[PDB]
Amino acid sequence: MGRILFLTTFMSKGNKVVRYLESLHHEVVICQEKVHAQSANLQEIDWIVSYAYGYILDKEIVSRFRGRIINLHPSLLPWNKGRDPVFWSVWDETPKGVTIHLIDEHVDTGDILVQEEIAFADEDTLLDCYNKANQAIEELFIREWENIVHGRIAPYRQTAGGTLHFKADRDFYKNLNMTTVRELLALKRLCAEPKEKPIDKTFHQLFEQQVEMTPDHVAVVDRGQSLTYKQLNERANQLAHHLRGKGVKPDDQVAIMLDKSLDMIVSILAVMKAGGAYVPIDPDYPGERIAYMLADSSAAILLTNALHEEKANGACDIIDVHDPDSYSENTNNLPHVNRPDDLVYVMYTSGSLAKGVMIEHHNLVNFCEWYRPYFGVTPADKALVYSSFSFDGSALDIFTHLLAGAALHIVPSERKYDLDALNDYCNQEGITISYLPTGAAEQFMQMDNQSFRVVITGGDVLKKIERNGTYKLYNGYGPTECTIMVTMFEVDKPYANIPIGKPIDRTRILILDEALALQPIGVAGELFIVGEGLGRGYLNRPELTAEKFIVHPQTGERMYRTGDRARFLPDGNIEFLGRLDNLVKIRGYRIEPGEIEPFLMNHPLIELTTVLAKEQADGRKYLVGYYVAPEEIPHGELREWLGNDLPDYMIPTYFVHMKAFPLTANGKVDRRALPDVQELLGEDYVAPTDELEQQLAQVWSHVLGIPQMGIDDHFLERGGDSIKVMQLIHQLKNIGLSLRYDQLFTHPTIRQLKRLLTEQKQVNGLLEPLRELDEQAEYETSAVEKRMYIIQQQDVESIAYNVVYTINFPLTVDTEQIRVALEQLVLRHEGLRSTYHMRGDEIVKRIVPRAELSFVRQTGEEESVQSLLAEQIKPFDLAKAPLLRAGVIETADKKVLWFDSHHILLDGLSKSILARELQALLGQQVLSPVEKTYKSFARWQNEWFASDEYEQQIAYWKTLLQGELPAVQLPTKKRPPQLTFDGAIQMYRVNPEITRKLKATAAKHDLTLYMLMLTIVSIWLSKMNSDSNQVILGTVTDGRQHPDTRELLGMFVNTLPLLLSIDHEESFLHNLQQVKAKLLPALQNQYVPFDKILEAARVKREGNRHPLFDVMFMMQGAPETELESNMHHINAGISKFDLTLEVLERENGLNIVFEYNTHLFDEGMILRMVAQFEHLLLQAVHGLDQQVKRFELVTEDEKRDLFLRVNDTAKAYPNKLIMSMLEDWAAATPDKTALVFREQRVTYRELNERVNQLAHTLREKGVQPDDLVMLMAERSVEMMVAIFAVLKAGGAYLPIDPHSPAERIAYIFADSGAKLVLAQSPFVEKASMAEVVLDLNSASSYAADTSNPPLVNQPGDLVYVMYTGKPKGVMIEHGALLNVLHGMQDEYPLLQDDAFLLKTTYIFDISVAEIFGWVPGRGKLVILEPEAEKNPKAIWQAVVGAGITHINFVPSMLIPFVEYLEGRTEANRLRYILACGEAMPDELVPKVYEVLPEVKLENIYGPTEATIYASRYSLAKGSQESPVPIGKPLPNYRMYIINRHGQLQPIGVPGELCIAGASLARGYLNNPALTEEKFTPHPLEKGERIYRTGDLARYREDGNIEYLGRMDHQVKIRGYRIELDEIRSKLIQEETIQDAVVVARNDAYLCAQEWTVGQLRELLRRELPEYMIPAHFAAPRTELEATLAHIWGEVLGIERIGIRDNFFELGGDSIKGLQIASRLQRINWTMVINHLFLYPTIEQIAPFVTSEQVVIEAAAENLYFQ
Ligand SMILES: *P(=O)(O)OCC(C)(C)[C@@H](O)C(=O)NCCC(=O)NCCNC(=O)CNC(=O)[C@@H](NC=O)C(C)C
User: Fold this and answer.
1) Which of 912, 1035, 1036, 1124 to mutate to test the pocket of ligand 1 (most atoms within 8 A of CB)?
2) Considering only CA atoms, which of 38, 39, 41 is closest in space to residue 28?
3) Is ligand 1 within 6 A of the CB of residue 901?
4) Where are the domains of the chain?
5) Contact at 8 Å (CB) between 1 and 25?
């Protein structure tokens, strides 16, 4: 032992490490603050252990305790030294690990003691990586601390190079903690600084270079006149000489007021050559505007003519461009005075006076030097100067193409607006490339153009892509402040939101938040531009330039504040989402009107769309949808068209039809000339006509929050939920009318609702208030409160039903104001002051006046917040208040408020109420005191349980949940024997777009979003349950039966079992309506407690699963407060059920949370399932009229992973047929041993020559290719001589067992119709009814010619016909046999020194692998004596004597061969024992490797219709494979597992195995019907055939297939499939291995050296589920067991309970355990309820618990009053 000073600052004081040190009987002194060398915290201490310790230790301390200071750093030092190490281990892509090192004078550079390499998953979030890393360094310390303190570990120095980081180095990569590793590394590439050459040129320099390259090329074309490059250059130099002499210096602002002409191009280049920048002034601008631009530009010279000279009013030195005295005689290039950082132009932006944007030379050059190579601009191109020279569009028109040698065509403003004339000019002049603004483009795309090859657009949101031309379409984005454009996208596909593209050269785009921090990919934010497009700024306006042109506080880079919202897509392109301020609020919903335009244009008749937001003086804002179409479209039609996938507040109130959209002169839609409309409520508004219709409309207005409802307005499509329907019903009770929850979906408008209720009379008393209970000592609990109490008492140390939520606050929030407000809520709500105790056998509640809240204040870092939180999640004692612990973890950037409650208090609605009231109290707002208490509701409901309605509702579940309920066997792992509540979480986010389509679809078809998701979940579960027609799942309801309990803090949620049906042969919409028809009756009987529902159903209690259902589907509405939207639910590693799906509406989308049992599902299994749910969800929302059968579960990524891991087996194999190999080999090695029968040896030559003779004798009998001759012979050399001779002649051999009954051979005589029969002498008389019968033992049936007969067979000719219920003839071709032989030879090679054993009967295909397995490789075939296959002695004698290396065994016959060999030590040459014919016992693998080491046991599978084999799995000496897979396909084999509808099944889901490839059979002989049934073409093979095996099989994660039995011989007990092999193995593992086999009989029931009677059930109970226990195969001892029998019997209701009786079998539940424990406490016995689940028998549990509470009698006995 020794004293240890534990130094931690951002970790806790009670960590696993400290407690482990205390467990070793150490004294751990913990200091969370600074320590000075003279601090008493440094005396008598032997070690110093640091762990997330802020502050650096003093120098004297490091030297004084040298070798005794130990730090726990969560990194693989030397990598990521310092702060935030785990995050930097990912972002900098460094090695991952953890290090226990020594402390030196520097930051984590000391010598290492131990180090471990941890691995992060790409799909793990950063927070997941933090927990994994911090746990690894803690467990490593627990593992090595003793080896350190005892000096058993030698410190080693660090490998040289690594990384160091500090505290503020992550303040930009925040907001990224929930982002996965792959998505983080992607955002890195998409937003990290790339490595390029700078710009050392100006435009005139580059233009003067191109002028020398294409001097005589036409440069500008105005009217019919033209100008070449040299002529343009010389005319500009003349004017620039005159300008520079007048007094133009760099950074001057010479203005130009000319119309589009040649003189404009000359003028522009003259200013730049002189040295200045040109300020374009439109000659048509107002006079005051012209003067402002001149005054602001500070221009002394004006380049105008005589038409626009008087528009200056003596404002500058006018230089007429038509006066010859304005041009010099110098046509030589001027001397250069400019720099790449000089102004080139100043264009003004009238964003409403204008602002002069200043652009420099290097900005334009970077754009021009990118434009030319991007679009391939050649000197052969033609572009038009379309845009006015007062906009940056003309810069792209003029400057980008002049640097490429192209020709500019000046567009007269007389045209330009006539897009028909522009298409003419473009066609008759061959214009190839140009830039058209968005509005003009979308109108030009309706023109027949053949000249353009590239058309670029940009300015407004581009939507239309359908064009009448062969030109490529490009979309661009960019503000004038950043040159012209910064991103470019090629419009290839149709897009809803056409991307603005990827950044251009020397330009980087960043999507940031309001704090200028990096947003994750997909999350929107402000577009920030960085690169060589950023100009100097605004002219004479430095304040605004500092506002938009900012330097980054963390990157030091100059950025432009675009003010636009955008998001990065995964591909790399940027998607424009709108302006950050142009968001309008319609019906209280902030929307972007531009999101509606793509849906309206998708209408078949609308070709142009623009949605505008207009306002009325009253305040209300309305959307107007302007559309261009051939004629008008009905208003309702447009409301229907948008209603298919848009909510109501985004459906415009008014629609305006237009012939053509007005365009501004800039090329954009006018958006101000668009006609106006008019306070009307629309055309679909029908006002109430009766008193009841107005009464209902006001109730509808109150619930849905919409004023002036319509008679034909749909409740669900205007915001109605389930709670809104129940509100409507309750508000109608106050009126006096009764509406059922189902009648709303059948009457979803006020019109129909009136017709239903107008015949009803107002009844009083329909809504009774809740009576407030008078003051009492104790209060009775509710049924759900009792149930939560019963659950917690099973394991009184469980956190499964603990409710943890965290909220991240800014550091400005007073931590005490939170505590104060939380302490107010403890007073306001009696639930926070309620304590639950037990009075006898009754659970009661007691309210306490005041309770003390636990508010722990801590300090932590980002990589410790979770582990600081995880230790605060401790069990609750339901007898102690406040039942809610809280606290605040303060980091350097946030304050994490946390609280932990119990589900007996905090349900879903209680969390929303608590967040609402905390946000009010934190806002210093008043809180009107509460009015009702949970004690009142409990009494109300406990009384309602004795009503008549309750008896009606309990009959619904008794008449429904009784019978053989559905069985959902999800593809899980092996179910643990007990119950596991260990779990994890995976999340799937549905984007806001699909979320709208899901909601709009549900509303359109009288459904809620919950009903729609429930069907998708039901279909998802059904398809995983082998396409079941019925499923069972669970859900949760609010449980607020009395309407006065919606503001109370308590547990109300009730659990409902949902029995649903899915018809795969019908549409999604059909199943959607039938799901509603099964949910609504359940919601009408929803208030029966779940424990009573189970009892009424008379359900089992199988310990491997949960009652009634195993999967739960929950849905919570959107957050009502902002404090609620910023809350985070914590799982803490608990899964209450096998799988839970919760759909949470967050941020206009859907966050679907997958809570799963970690013992039943892996991370990869869940990742496949969340991807399959998305696959079905997208398939369904886009396939409503489609049948559910046509939806596929497997994803394209799973289809391609299954191919690569399984069906990628193609390998080119030689086409030399097996006969030609015997010829080729015999000629090479003629006297080498080929056959060995008994003690005689045949050589290749002897075999070949003997085979040749019988071949010639066969040819003269009419043996032609694809002719069949039957064989009746036993194991001999003649059989081998026969078989090979059949093939040499050209035919195929048909094996016929010679000892077959005459009826069988007659059948195969008829079906084959074959005439020839090669038989042995004892069987010639059996072939009596043939034609040509030859005795193989008579030299008459042989000939003299030892010559090899000619080759007459082709790779597609039949080689044998194996017969298999009347047998059928499987026809096998040559190349089929050649492929399985080459594959087996490539896998299990038989070489020259190796051999085979002929032991399988030739009426079995496995024999063929022995008949021919030796020919490739030139081995030998030892022919086992006939009937010796049953004698393992004779078998063994052969392998030892002949050196047999390849042997085939049926698993049943390998058992007697593994025996006998037990003990024998004779040497062996065996190499492969290939097993096939039946399922391999899991116990045989070790038995084989024990008796015969060095052998390689291999399990092979293959039907006769796939030659011989098809799949193989190599068993290893590890002996750990319980499934015993049949394996993966062989070379050029492909296997598929399909469902009942022909779809590929995913991993784990069972289906029918199917085969495909080269070694497939040609078909059944004389049975084309069966050939068409079992050999079918399939889209998986692209029209090629597949063989239906008829065997059930499942895919494994490895890829190896598992044999599940024949589909027509499948055993199912109560729906669940039975694996009878797993039953026998669990029965054989005992000592008495009688090896009894289990089989199923029908009465359907399972039946199967010890007097085991019913005790074997107890053995098969702790390993197998009750549905896989074979049905057919009182002695209380002490006073304790005698007592236990009485309490059990009295509670369970059973008489004479004996020990060794299963408590749960006797009807036990977690409720009856609490009763049994309660009765036992009053007699001072102590039983733990969890022990009942571990020791379900009395003799088992009586010692393992049932301790006594010691009673004493003393203290003060005698008193003496002095
Ligand atoms: P015993 O186990 O032998 O007897 C059987 C019974 C019926 C007693 C027992 O098995 C039982 O009660 N089963 C049902 C338990 C159940 O349904 N628990 C679910 C409770 N609801 C939730 O966990 C989720 N509800 C919420 O409101 C959460 N919202 C989101 O998570 C809150 C935590 C906010």
Assistant:
1) 1036
2) 41
3) no
4) 3-170, 691-757, 779-927+934-939, 947-1122+1147-1193, 1611-1668, 1679-1748
5) yes
Yes or no: say if 688 and 708 are a contact pair by the CB < 8 Å rule.
Answer: no
CA of 594 to the centre of ligand 1 (A): 44
Please give the number of the atom of ligand 1 that sits closest to the Cα of 1091: 7
Q: Is the Cβ atom of 1017 under 6 angstroms away from ligand 1?
A: no
Helix-helix angle 934-944:783-794, to 10 degrees: 100
- For residue 1050 and ligand 1, the question of a CB distance below 6 A is answered with no
Experimental method: X-ray
Encoded tokens for 579: 């302006």
The residues, any chain, with a CB within 8 Å of residue 1222's CB and separated by 6 or more, are 1244, 1247, 1248, 1251, 1284, 1415
Whether 947-1122+1147-1193 and 1679-1748 share one fold: the answer is no
Give the architecture-level CATH label for domain 1611-1668: 2-Layer Sandwich (3.30)
- Structurally, at CATH architecture level, domain 1679-1748 sits in Orthogonal Bundle (1.10)
For ligand 1, the distance from its centroid to the CA atom of residue 1137, given in whole angstroms, is 9
Closest ligand 1 atom to Cα of 1034: 17
Distance CA 1138, CA 1160 (A): 7
Residue 1107 CB less than 6 A away from ligand 1: yes
Q: Is the CB of 1710 under 6 A from ligand 1?
A: yes
The response to whether residue 1036 sits with its C-beta less than 6 Å from ligand 1 reads yes
Give me the CATH code for the 3-170 domain, please: 3.40.50.170
Cβ of 800 below 6 Å from ligand 1 = no
CB-ligand 1 contact for 790 (6 Å cutoff): yes
Distance 1136 CA to ligand 1 centre (A): 7
Resolution reading in Å: 3.0
Distance 784 CA to ligand 1 centre (A): 9
Q: Closest Cα partner for 399 from 451, 343, 361? A: 361
- Domain 947-1122+1147-1193 grouped into CATH 3.30.559.30: yes
Hey, which residues does 102 pair with through a beta bridge? 70
Q: After which residues is the chain broken (C to N over 2.5 A)?
A: 195, 352, 678, 1364, 1643, 1648, 1673
User: Hunting for tokens 């004038």 — which residue is that?
Assistant: 480
Residue 1653 to residues 1061, 1079, 1643, 1650, 1672, Cα–Cα distance (Å): 41, 46, 21, 9, 10
Q: Which of 984, 860, 880 is nearest to 51 (CA)?
A: 860
| Dist CA 1667 CA 482 (whole Å) | 72
Q: Which atom of ligand 1 is nearest to the CA of 790?
A: 8
Is 1.10.1200.10 the CATH number for 691-757?
yes
Q: What is the dihedral of CA 1701, 1707, 1710, 1711, to 10 degrees?
A: -130
Listed in sequence order, the residues at least 6 apart from 1073 whose beta carbon sits closer than 8 Å to its beta carbon are: 1005, 1006, 1007
